């Protein structure tokens, strides 16, 4: 839209005599536009524009005042001698009307630093108590920013902050309780007093409930001195107000870590609280869930199941379907795994691209996470190899192989061997590296290595350096571990492929010379099974968890 | 030509990447690399070409993009395996572009030249060390540095790390740990089979032509002759695709 | 129709041949039952994809045909004839098969077992 | 104190007609635009009050040539976020004196900038009452 240089420059006239509220306000709008449209200010011109604007604060017009608040915050850090604007902001801030009140405190407090903290306090105390949400909330968020510059000034405001807390007005309360918790904190106990005061109350403020739930979620029994229960009579453990997010947050914490135990009018150990909200619209997403629950996610899992499972199967909408998979995943557990695996199998049919990779990873990942046998995990890992053939990667060769050598290795190599029949060079560097690494390392007597060798031999020709280099070194280790093997090593290595390419040659010259020429003290030593280059954890399963409902 | 070799070297000199003309250089790494290998295969074929190839290869390097050096270093290092202590001269040129780095290839190749060539030079702690504490992509770097870094003459270098510091380094880079060249970039090796261990065992006689890395480095795996694709690539890289 | 190693290789790459079966009576080499049967499902055993030695030496045939079915047909017959202390399944061969949508792949897979008819009226 | 991660009002490509970042996670244009393109690609051509992108619940709506965004946490739900998104749509409409399209926003770039800052303040929900925002802002 605009050019940052021209607009930053023409702003310098304010610094002199011209104040023209219309022109300057426009020029300011343009600054906000340069940022908004996406541009970056030049520092000299910015510094100049900032000193100029402060003159403009003399003229009190509500649109010009507004421009001035956003522009000084954005230009504050890329400007010098900004301190002059504090006075002008205080002058504005005391002026009655929400346009000035709220927006000024926020602009002022952002620029304000511990020296300046003292100045804003009278005006701040007046602005915080307001049940007019703009002035009070802006002043409450403003105080949060100020805790950094100077803690002590902000702390004095705890009384005004508390005063706002008593509102049932959603903003004034959300901001008031949230801010207070941050402010008054010198020990757990004083914050806990602040929370108990509001705690017995059936708010109509969902945001306050939410911010507070978080403070509350841990068992607090020192709220306002002491009390005999972790009790929260505001939805956290109670269900005084129904509204699917608040209900979900509260229900997952309380069930197996009581914020209070179950009440007839407020389940808080029982699985119920989520579930009564569970059949719903788009809204259902919070409601349908789970997490924790008594004693497991599984009795819980059954309720909600109709909802999560029908959307997940039906909707090939990304937005719905994602909520449906996350919701299935949540109602899941060790038990649930039979059900979870069929659904996840089914899911890729709706969204099949990355989502395909993810379901074939998920079915394996779930089998590793939630035990349906380690073998089945390998069998799923074969299905992943089959379906994608390339969205397995390098980290997969290391993870599959390490995981495999817990039990599967003879089978895995063999499966891999079959899998290698796929596609000669589009199968990728990685599969060839897996059959190669596994055939090298196991040294098949489970199947004849000759199929494996014949399969790998073709793949190497037309695939990347790293695998061809891999293939010579593996062969060498394969030699040292099994005597039998040496004749195949020689036909393979003399070839222009497994040696005498580039990287492949260098490694080969070394690996070959050590096997061929040298004692093989070194070769022998080197093979301890013929293992991978690193043994990490089991990476796939967490990756897969986030990746599927994206 | 002589066979094909003579006129292929001339022809390759024109095609392969330089600082001379930027109508014959390109920042796509495989094509550049292939072109280095085609020029270089002529030497492997016929001797006369070795003498022509090495100075042209140094011009290839002079481009001084991370990648441009990289491709250059990768073939020339193969040529040295063929051409034992004949390309001593190149090492000093080859180090130069090793410092600005964003790729694997440059590290691999450079570490191999500088490594094999150590008797000739004495720079090596200084050159290697900027890279060893620099980043880019380093998987395959490990493999190539592992067999490579110590080599040739036991104590014939020194800048603040003699050839022995290099063997120390060479071992750390392979899979060990050691303060030397301000630590290596990575240690964890390339593709699963390769590992550190063979070379770690090795360097019986510390980076010296005997029966160590140096031996391997100054020798070429199997037969290497002609354009039968044994350290060769079979004519000029562009004609071959067809 | 027939292929050379380059055409076979190109087609391998071109479309998948992961599909395999193991066919009994592939105990024998490429030349004997397997060629004759493969011939009748208008196929032919051409070039190799093998890598033989003292540990390796499955017989490998690269097959081709160009079926009047809108597909080609290709396969590799690997004959698992022991050249190791641990064979796959001993004598027998696993035929890795394809066709262009693998609708003739299957024909290759079973028509390399057995095949004979006679009457004597 | 935090609900809203960011607010974006995007054309039907995901490019920045507007975004104002109530996160500190996008200040540079390249990344602010990337974010915008990212959220628009998931959420768009499937209108609901839910989307899950980047592990965060994204609440969105649409108009003729814009998709309107609130991104917030996913420990919540659509409805909490939706109240911000409804304010965002509504307040801009009443403010500009015309419904949110690319044309209304461009028509009054100033009304749009000011109105959004009143709705979200550094990721806390400052205001959510459309009426309040509009009176609060002066064109």
DSSP string across B189-222: -SSTT--SHHHHH--SSTT-SSSSHHHHHTS-SS
Instruction: Report whether A89 contacts A70 (CB < 8 A).
Output: no
**C96 in contact with A at a CB cutoff of 8 Å?**
yes
Calculate how close chain A gets to D47, using CA atoms only, in Å: 8
Residue with tokens 């918790």: A181
Q: From CA C97, how far away is CA A163, in angstroms rounded?
A: 80
Experimental technique of record: cryo-EM
Q: Do A503 and B222 touch (CB under 8 A)?
A: no
C3: phi then psi, degrees, rounded to nearest 5? -135, 165
A41 token code pair? 């200010």
| Residue A12 vs residues A46, A50, A59, A71, A445: alpha-carbon distances, Å | 9, 9, 17, 14, 84
| Residues in Cβ contact with A331 at an 8 Å cutoff, skipping those fewer than 6 apart | A288, A289, A290, A297, A300, A301, A304, A305, A308
CA A70 to chain centre: 30
Instruction: Tell which residue, B201, B182, B7, C39, has the closest CA to residue A520.
Output: B201
Residues in chain A: 550
Residue with tokens 């649409």: D62
A28 token code pair? 């300011």
Instruction: Report whether C64 contacts C1 (CB < 8 A).
Output: yes
| Residues in Cβ contact with B85 at an 8 Å cutoff, skipping those fewer than 6 apart | B152, B218
3-state secondary structure of B22: coil
Rg (CA), chain A: 33
**Interface mutation target, options B103, B107, B109, B193, chain A, most CBs of A under 10 Å:** B193
Q: From CA D63, how far away is CA D69, in angstroms rounded?
A: 12
| Residues in Cβ contact with D89 at an 8 Å cutoff, skipping those fewer than 6 apart | D61, D63, D68, D100
Which residues in chain A have Cβ-Cβ distances shorter than 8 Å to B216? 509-510, 513-514
3-state secondary structure of A355: helix
Q: Do A106 and D137 touch (CB under 8 A)?
A: no
A-C C-beta contacts closer than 8 Å: 99
Angle at A1 between CA D93 and CA D131, to 5 degrees: 15
Instruction: Tell which residue, C100, C106, C110, C38, has the closest CA to residue C69.
Output: C100
Which ranges of C41-120 does DSSP label H, i.e. alpha helix? 105-110
Q: Is the dihedral of CA A458, A459, A462, A468 positive or negative?
A: negative
Residue with tokens 């989307």: D51
Instruction: Report whether B219 contacts B225 (CB < 8 A).
Output: no
Calculate how close chain B gets to A440, using CA atoms only, in Å: 8
Q: Do A210 and D138 touch (CB under 8 A)?
A: no
Instruction: Tell which residue, A67, A64, A30, A60, has the closest CA to residue A45.
Output: A30
Q: From CA B193, how far away is CA B188, in angstroms rounded?
A: 12
Closest residue to D76, CB basis, from A210, A319, A546: A210
Dihedral (C-alpha) A300, A305, A309, A315: value to the nearest 10 degrees? -100
| DSSP conformational letter for D17 | E
Residue with tokens 């005042």: A65
Is B57 exposed, middle or buried, given 0-12, 13-18 or 19+ CB atoms closer than 10 A?
buried
Q: Give the containing element (helix H, strand E) for D5.
A: strand D4-11
Q: Is the dihedral of CA A500, A504, A509, A513 positive or negative?
A: negative
Residue with tokens 């509220």: A21
According to DSSP, the residues that pair with A140 across neighbouring strands are none
Calculate how close chain C gets to A443, using CA atoms only, in Å: 10
Q: From CA B58, how far away is CA B79, in angstroms rounded?
A: 13
| Residue A458 vs residues C5, C45, D103: alpha-carbon distances, Å | 11, 18, 61
Q: From CA A432, how far away is CA A471, in angstroms rounded?
A: 9
A206: phi then psi, degrees, rounded to nearest 5? -65, -40
Q: Is the dihedral of CA A91, A97, A98, A100 positive or negative?
A: negative
Burial per residue of B115-142, b for 16 or more beta-carbon CB atoms within 10 angstroms, e otherwise: bbbbbbbebbbebbbebbebebbbbbbb
CB atoms within 10 A of CB A550: 17
Q: From CA A437, how far away is CA A460, in angstroms rounded?
A: 13
A311 token code pair? 């959307």
Strand order in the sheet with D66-72: D16-20, D4-11, D66-72, D56-62, D52-53
Q: Give the containing element (helix H, strand E) for A380.
A: helix A374-387
Instruction: Tell which residue, A487, A434, A480, has the closest CA to residue A456.
Output: A434
| Residues in Cβ contact with A107 at an 8 Å cutoff, skipping those fewer than 6 apart | A68, A69, A70, A72, A73, A89
3-state secondary structure of A356: helix
Q: From CA D77, how far away is CA D72, in angstroms rounded?
A: 9
Q: Do B201 and A503 touch (CB under 8 A)?
A: no
CA C59 to chain centre: 10
Calculate how close chain A gets to D15, using CA atoms only, in Å: 10
Helices (H) and strands (E) in chain A, counts: 31, 0
CA A14 to chain centre: 45
Closest residue to A505, CB basis, from B148, B190, B231: B231
Q: From CA A93, how far away is CA A85, in angstroms rounded?
A: 12
CA A268 to chain centre: 28
Closest residue to A500, CB basis, from B33, B211, B231: B231
CB atoms within 10 A of CB D80: 26
Is A228 exposed, middle or buried, given 0-12, 13-18 or 19+ CB atoms closer than 10 A?
exposed
CA B170 to chain centre: 15
Using CB atoms, which chains have 3+ pairs under 8 A with A?
Answer: B, C, D
A103 token code pair? 């927006």
Q: From CA A216, how far away is CA A181, in angstroms rounded?
A: 11
Using CB atoms, which chains have 3+ pairs under 8 A with D?
Answer: A
Chains B and C touch (3+ CB pairs under 8 A): no
Q: Do A141 and D126 touch (CB under 8 A)?
A: yes
B177 token code pair? 């740990």
Calculate how close chain C gets to A452, using CA atoms only, in Å: 9
Residue with tokens 């060893």: B132
A-D C-beta contacts closer than 8 Å: 151
CB atoms within 10 A of CB A485: 26
| Residue C69 vs residues A316, C101, C105: alpha-carbon distances, Å | 35, 10, 12
Q: From CA B3, how far away is CA D55, in angstroms rounded?
A: 65
Q: Do A533 and B195 touch (CB under 8 A)?
A: yes
Q: Give the containing element (helix H, strand E) for C20.
A: strand C20-23
| Residues in Cβ contact with A346 at an 8 Å cutoff, skipping those fewer than 6 apart | A312, A313
Q: From CA A304, how far away is CA A332, in angstroms rounded?
A: 11
CA A263 to chain centre: 34
| Residue A244 vs residues A281, A323, A325, B136, B165: alpha-carbon distances, Å | 11, 14, 18, 48, 65
Q: Pairing between strand C73-79 and C93-99?
A: antiparallel
Both ends of chain B: CA-CA distance in Å? 21
Q: Give the containing element (helix H, strand E) for A98.
A: helix A98-111
Which residues in chain A have Cβ-Cβ distances shorter than 8 Å to D33? 38
B63: phi then psi, degrees, rounded to nearest 5? -50, -50
Instruction: Tell which residue, A12, A17, A8, A5, has the closest CA to residue A46.
Output: A8
| DSSP conformational letter for A506 | H
CA closest to A458 among chain C residues: C49
**A499 in contact with B at a CB cutoff of 8 Å?**
yes
CB atoms within 10 A of CB A441: 25
Q: From CA A315, how far away is CA A351, in angstroms rounded?
A: 9
According to DSSP, the residues that pair with C62 across neighbouring strands are C76
Instruction: Tell which residue, D35, D136, D32, D57, has the closest CA to residue D94.
Output: D136
Closest residue to A454, CB basis, from C16, C50, C86: C50
């Amino acid at each position: 839209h605009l050019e940052k240089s021209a607009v930053l420059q023409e702003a310098r006239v304010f610094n002199e005599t011209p104040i023209n509220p219309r022109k300057c306000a426009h020029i300011l709008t343009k600054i906000l536009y340069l940022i908004n449209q996406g541009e970056h200010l030049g520092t000299t011109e910015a510094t100049e524009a900032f000193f100029a604007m402060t003159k403009l604060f003399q003229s009190n017009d509500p649109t010009l005042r507004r421009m001035c608040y956003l522009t000084i915050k954005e230009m504050s850090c890329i400007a010098e001698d900004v301190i002059i604007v504090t006075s002008s902001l205080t002058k504005d801030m005391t002026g009655k009307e929400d346009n000035y009140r709220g927006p000024a405190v926020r602009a002022l407090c952002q620029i304000t630093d511990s020296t300046m903290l003292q100045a804003v306090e009278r005006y701040m105390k007046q602005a915080i108590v307001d049940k007019v949400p703009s002035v009070s909330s802006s002043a409450l968020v403003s105080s949060l920013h100020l805790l950094k510059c100077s803690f002590d000034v902000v702390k004095r405001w705890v009384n005004e902050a508390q005063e706002a807390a008593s509102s049932d007005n959603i903003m004034v309360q959300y901001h008031a309780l949230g801010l207070l918790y941050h402010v008054r904190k010198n020990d757990r106990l004083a914050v806990s007093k602040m929370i108990s005061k509001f705690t017995r109350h059936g708010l109509k403020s969902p945001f306050a409930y939410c911010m507070m739930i978080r403070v509350a979620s841990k068992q607090l029994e020192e709220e306002d001195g002491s009390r005999d229960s972790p009790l929260f009579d505001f939805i956290e453990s109670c269900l005084r107000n129904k509204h699917e997010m608040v209900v979900y947050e509260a229900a997952s914490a309380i069930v197996n870590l009581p914020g209070c135990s179950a009440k007839e009018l407020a389940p808080a150990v029982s699985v119920l609280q989520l579930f009564c909200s569970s059949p719903k619209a788009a809204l259902r997403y919070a409601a349908v869930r789970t997490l924790n629950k008594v004693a497991m996610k599984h009795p819980s899992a059954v309720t909600a199941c109709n909802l999560d499972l029908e959307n997940l199967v039906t909707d090939s909408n990304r937005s719905i379907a994602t909520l449906a998979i996350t919701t299935l995943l949540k109602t899941g557990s060790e038990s649930s795994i039979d059900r979870l695996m069929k659904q996840i199998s089914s899911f890729m049919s709706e969204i099949s691209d990355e989502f395909k990779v993810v379901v074939v990873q998920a079915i394996s990942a779930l089998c590793q996470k939630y035990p349906r046998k380690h073998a089945v995990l390998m069998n799923f890992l074969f299905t992943m190899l089959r379906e994608e053939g390339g969205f397995e990667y390098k980290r997969a060769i290391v993870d599959c192989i390490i995981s495999i050598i817990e039990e599967n290795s003879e089978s895995k190599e063999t499966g891999l061997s079959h899998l290698c029949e796929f596609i000669e060079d589009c199968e990728f560097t990685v599969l060839a590296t897996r059959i190669l690494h596994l055939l090298g390392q196991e040294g098949p007597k489970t199947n004849n290595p000759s199929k494996y060798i014949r399969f790998i031999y073709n793949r190497v020709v037309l695939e990347h350096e790293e695998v061809r280099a891999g293939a010579v070194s593996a062969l060498a280790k394969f030699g040292a571990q099994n005597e039998e093997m040496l004749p195949s090593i020689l036909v393979l290595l003399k070839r222009c492929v497994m040696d005498d390419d580039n990287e492949v040659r260098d490694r080969a010259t070394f690996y070959l010379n050590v096997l061929e020429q040298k004692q093989k003290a070194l070769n022998a030593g080197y093979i301890l099974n013929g293992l991978t280059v690193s043994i990490p954890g089991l990476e796939k399963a967490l990756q897969q968890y986030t990746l599927e409902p994206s | 030509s002589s066979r094909n070799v003579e006129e292929l070297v001339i022809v390759l000199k024109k095609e392969v990447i330089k600082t001379n003309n930027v109508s014959e250089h390109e920042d796509t790494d495989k094509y550049r690399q292939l072109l280095v290998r085609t020029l270089h295969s002529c030497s492997v074929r016929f001797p006369d070409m070795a003498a022509n190839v090495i100075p042209v290869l140094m011009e290839f390097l002079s481009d001084s993009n991370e990648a441009a050096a990289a491709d250059v270093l990768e073939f020339v290092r193969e040529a040295i395996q063929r051409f034992d202590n004949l390309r001593m001269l190149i090492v000093e040129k080859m180090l130069e572009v090793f410092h600005a780095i964003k790729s694997v290839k440059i590290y691999r190749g450079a570490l191999w030249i500088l490594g094999e060539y150590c008797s000739t030079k004495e720079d090596i702690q200084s050159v290697m060390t900027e890279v060893r504490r620099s980043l880019g992509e380093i998987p395959i770097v490990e493999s190539e540095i592992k067999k490579e870094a110590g080599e040739l003459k036991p104590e014939e270098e020194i800048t603040v790390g003699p050839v022995q510091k290099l063997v120390t380094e060479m071992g750390t880079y392979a899979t060990q740990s050691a303060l030397s060249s301000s630590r290596p970039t990575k240690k964890e090796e390339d593709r699963p089979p390769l590992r550190g261990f063979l070379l770690d065992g090795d360097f019986f006689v510390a980076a010296s032509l005997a029966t160590t890395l140096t031996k391997i480095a100054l020798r070429y795996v199997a037969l290497v002759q002609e354009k039968k694709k044994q350290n060769s690539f079979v004519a000029e890289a562009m004609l071959l695709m067809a | 129709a027939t292929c050379t190693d380059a055409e076979f290789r190109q087609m391998w790459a071109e479309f998948e041949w992961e599909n395999k079966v193991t066919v009994n009576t592939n105990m024998t080499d490429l030349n004997d039952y397997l060629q004759h049967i493969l011939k009748s499902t208008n196929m032919k055993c051409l070039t190799p994809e093998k890598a033989l030695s003292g540990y390796c030496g499955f017989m490998a045939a690269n097959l081709y045909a160009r079926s009047i079915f809108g597909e080609d047909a290709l396969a590799n017959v690997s004959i698992e004839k022991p050249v190791h202390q641990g064979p796959d399944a001993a004598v027998t061969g696993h035929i890795r098969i394809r066709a262009k949508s693998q609708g003739m792949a299957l024909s290759l897979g079973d028509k390399i077992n057995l095949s004979q008819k006679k009457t004597s009226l | 104190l935090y609900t809203v991660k960011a607010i974006l009002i995007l054309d039907n490509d995901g490019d920045r007609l507007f975004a104002k970042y109530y996160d500190d996670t996008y200040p540079s244009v390249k990344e602010q635009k990337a974010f915008e393109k990212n959220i628009f690609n998931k959420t768009h051509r499937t209108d609901s009050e839910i989307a899950l992108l980047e592990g965060l619940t994204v609440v969105y709506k649409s108009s003729i040539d814009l998709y309107f965004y609130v991104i917030g946490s996913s420990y919540e739900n659509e409805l909490m976020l939706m109240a911000v998104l409804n304010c965002l749509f509504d307040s801009l409409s009443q403010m500009l004196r015309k419904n949110v399209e690319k044309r209304a926003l461009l028509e009054n770039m100033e009304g749009l900038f000011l109105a959004v800052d009143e709705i979200v303040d550094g990721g806390v929900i400052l205001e959510s009452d459309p009426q309040q925002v509009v009176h609060r802002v002066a064109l």
